[PDB]
């Protein structure tokens, strides 16, 4: 059966010829890509057993790539996709070479879906979604909890770093629903896109639900993102919007609605326009417009180390912020906002 893949050598044949493909749980050899970029229209790929990867210490290497139209990638009971993360982690993340993108979803269109995948131990960023349209990703568990501890190369630091769950760019009508992410960086990060929906997420250990950092990239327009009915726990931030200093662009129509926070270390809500090379400058610029941002029923408790709210907009670059029913409490550092007024909600 050419459509039932039991070893890497049989994959290409199946992708070329088959509309229903089963991957039975094998190790992908070093430097070799689990290449689903040529999937036929209306094809289905089902993961079974445990899929593993040999070590490929290469920043530019992408282990799994997905592309096609009206495709389905899904998982059967008991399946596991292991990303060999333990072989790479060194406390420093994207800064020892490590494949930067574990799964690339590119040019995937036409009501495609990725459902019910069980993924653990991935090297750096997990999903990189790009150039796609009408895509649903639902029911996934991304478990990188094994990276929380230090290892033989990370000194005192957590071994896994920069382990974003879902990065989205240059995509339209993407829905992320009912996914669990245990990681060490952004649960979701949207740097560009339109009509993005992120619903029923459970995000633990990372940096929260984020727009940005926007600006200076190939696409610098974010328009219409909804973060709905989600949990953020044990994370650096709850809700976050960032734009890069000196850049131009637009963040418009972003809603955080019914977001529950527990044990947030740094910012309940964080909106700032002063980011320069992954760090704040304190001097926001006004080339990136941020407009029609709603925080509706963002509630819960943040850690004593945190500020409940932080807003640092540039001059005239922020407009139309709406606050309703929020209850972010517990911060021991006084909150700080410069828009809409000089006072925060909490």
């Amino acid at each position: 059966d050419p459509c039932s893949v039991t070893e890497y050598s049989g994959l290409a044949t199946a992708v070329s010829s088959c509309k229903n493909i089963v991957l039975n749980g094998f190790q992908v050899p070093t430097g070799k890509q689990l290449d689903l970029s040529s999937l036929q229209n209306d094809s289905t790929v089902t993961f079974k057993g445990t899929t593993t990867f040999a070590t490929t210490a290469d920043n530019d290497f992408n282990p799994i790539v997905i592309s096609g139209s009206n495709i389905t990638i899904t998982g059967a009971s008991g399946h596991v996709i292991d990303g060999n993360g333990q072989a790479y982690w060194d406390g420093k993340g994207s800064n020892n070479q490590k494949p930067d993108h574990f799964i690339v979803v590119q040019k995937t269109t036409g009501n495609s879906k990725i459902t019910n995948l069980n993924i653990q131990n991935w090297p750096v960023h997990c999903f990189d979604i790009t150039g796609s349209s009408q895509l649903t990703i639902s029911g996934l568990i991304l478990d990188n909890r094994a990276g929380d501890k230090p290892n033989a190369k990370s000194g005192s630091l957590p071994a896994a770093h920069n382990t974003d769950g879902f990065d989205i760019s240059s995509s339209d009508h993407v829905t992320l629903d009912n996914n669990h992410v245990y990681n060490q960086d952004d649960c979701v990060a949207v740097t560009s896109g339109t009509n993005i929906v992120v619903s029923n997420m459970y995000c633990s250990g990372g940096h929260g639900l984020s727009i940005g950092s926007v600006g200076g990239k190939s696409d610098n327009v974010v328009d219409g993102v909804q973060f709905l009915s989600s949990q953020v726990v044990n994370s650096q931030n709850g809700c976050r919007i960032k734009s890069n200093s000196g850049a131009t662009g637009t963040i418009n129509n972003v809603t955080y609605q019914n977001i529950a926070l527990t044990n947030i270390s740094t910012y309940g809500v964080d909106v700032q326009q002063d980011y320069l090379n992954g760090g704040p400058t304190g001097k926001p610029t006004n080339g990136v417009k941020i407009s029609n941002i709603k925080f509706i029923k963002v509630t819960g408790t943040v850690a004593s180390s945190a500020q409940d709210w932080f807003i640092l907009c540039g001059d005239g670059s922020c407009s139309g912020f709406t606050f309703s029913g929020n209850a972010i409490t517990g911060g021991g550092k006084t909150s700080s906002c410069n828009y809409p007024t000089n006072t925060c909600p909490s």
């Binding site: 070479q97 200076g216 080339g287």
Partner: protein
């Protein structure tokens, strides 16, 4: 209602001028346009005039081709105007836009708008950014916009703009930090007057530019990204100074010669580098992040050597 009656008339007239597209179904004449129900419409809650000051027209899927409605001029308080992702939006940028005397942020992008970028934009003194990327605009760059005193960036990528970059484009204010005009048909040399700019981001890739680009470099600049790939630039790269903030340098497919500057070693945040397909020679500076890069970052040069490449003899 909070909605101003003239603003409401103007919005419904714009909708009509676009053929009453179904995507603007929420613009019901029986409802308050200031309540967030009308898709893409926001009113001024900062001054509490509640005049319409933020309009977003995106992905409208027009059934027929329509020009930009001149009725936009009847929303005189627009601060932010985004028109994007509309294949059936056609025709030139209309002089009605010149009546929007409070406009700060203007985007007309990913459409079929055509014709020249109009010089009347120089009259809208409040302009902070212009984004006219990925349309079908032609002609040459309007020199007068260099006089805009609040302008921080222009984004003109992906059109059919020709001719040389005006010498006047060195006269933007010290607030001006971003210039992208990639993917056009620009010819000639980068003006020496660009010594007077201090750009965080510059992208002039995929044009027909010739000659020296050293004026875009300098250890005194506050520059994050320099993107000049796929031109016919030619200068001695080893003589340039580098901004401490530089995180991306893309010079691929030019005729740049000389050795790589040793200052590359001191760049803490350099995370993207591509100097492939040029005429560079000598040892790659050893240090910093230079050895992290794939050999393909340095490939197809004249006589480069050193890690990541084979060692020099």
């Amino acid at each position: 209602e909070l909605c101003n009656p003239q603003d409401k008339q103007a919005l419904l007239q714009i909708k009509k001028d676009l053929g009453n597209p179904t995507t603007l179904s929420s613009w019901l004449p029986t409802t308050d346009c200031c309540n967030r129900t009308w898709l893409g419409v926001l009113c001024d809650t900062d001054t509490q005039t509640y005049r319409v000051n933020n309009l977003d027209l995106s992905g409208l899927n027009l059934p027929k081709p329509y020009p930009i409605p001149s009725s936009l001029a009847n929303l005189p308080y627009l601060n932010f105007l985004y028109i994007g992702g509309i294949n059936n939006l056609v025709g030139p940028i209309p002089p009605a836009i010149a009546k929007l005397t409070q406009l700060h942020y203007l985007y007309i992008t990913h459409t079929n708008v055509s014709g020249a970028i109009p010089d009347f934009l120089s009259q809208i003194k409040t302009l902070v950014t212009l984004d006219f990327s990925y349309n079908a605009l032609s002609g040459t760059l309007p020199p007068s916009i260099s006089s805009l005193p609040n302008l921080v960036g222009i984004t003109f990528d992906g059109n059919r703009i020709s001719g040389a970059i005006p010498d006047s484009y060195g006269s933007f204010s010290k607030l001006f930090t971003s210039m992208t005009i990639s993917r056009n048909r620009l010819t000639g040399k980068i003006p020496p007057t660009f010594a007077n700019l201090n750009l965080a981001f510059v992208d002039l890739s995929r044009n027909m530019l010739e000659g020296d680009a050293s004026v875009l470099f300098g250890s005194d600049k506050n520059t994050q990204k320099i993107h000049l790939a796929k031109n016919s630039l030619a200068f001695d790269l080893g003589k340039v100074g580098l901004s401490k903030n530089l995180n991306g340098l893309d010079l691929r497919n030019n005729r740049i010669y000389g050795t790589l500057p040793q200052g590359l070693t001191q760049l803490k945040f350099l995370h993207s580098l591509d100097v492939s397909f040029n005429n560079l020679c000598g040892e790659i500076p050893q240090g910093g992040n230079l050895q992290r890069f794939d050999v393909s970052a340095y490939a197809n040069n004249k006589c480069l050597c050193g890690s990541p490449l084979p060692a020099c003899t």
